[PDB]
């Protein structure tokens, strides 16, 4: 999945 704030991986 992806963090909505920075696009990095969760």
């Amino acid at each position: 999945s992806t963090k909505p704030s920075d696009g990095n991986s969760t």
Partner: antibody
Amino acid sequence: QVQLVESGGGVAQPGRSLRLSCAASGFSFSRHGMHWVRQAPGKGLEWVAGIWFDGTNDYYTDSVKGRFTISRDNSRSTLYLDINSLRAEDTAVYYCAREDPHLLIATLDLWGLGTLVTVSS
Amino acid sequence: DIQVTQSPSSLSAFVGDRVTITCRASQGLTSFINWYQQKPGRAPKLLISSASSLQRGVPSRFTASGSGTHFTLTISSLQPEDFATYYCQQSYGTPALAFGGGTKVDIKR
């Protein structure tokens, strides 16, 4: 020095445009989400804009959407904030801030010293 | 709209006292919370994240308890460099970030 350095502040007239820059040094800028946070004189911190590590998915607080654009040039390790029409309420110190990639709450772990924008006639 | 509110707005303490700040925040993305510290004329800095688990350079006398919409920061044995203003901060799925209004800790006398 692991740091962020904001520039572009100064006195500007309401209705004019402005471009702030933030120069990153000492870390891998292209691995981090980045943000702008401002502080009006005598007031608390207000988050205004954020962007993904790759320059996509720029997002804003409601009161600046359509007026502010956050953007980045990863080849030059620089973050930008464009304001297309300034309002008196935009007077503030503007900080650029780095987001921690590993925490799921958006966390700002590195701040510049800020640049003062004074909107006045 | 999203609201993040801190209580009290200000508090005084002696060097060595124990201090607790409250943060009430519209439910966020992760039920964690962040605290920042700012001194007059200076830039804010990250103090502690309730999401962290490594040790970090945090001097550890700071504790961030809570979850949901209700959080606290506690300073056991306040030290001179701790007099400052403290902000809590939440993040959201819109996405967005939101700072509380701040709590100023000043020197009691």
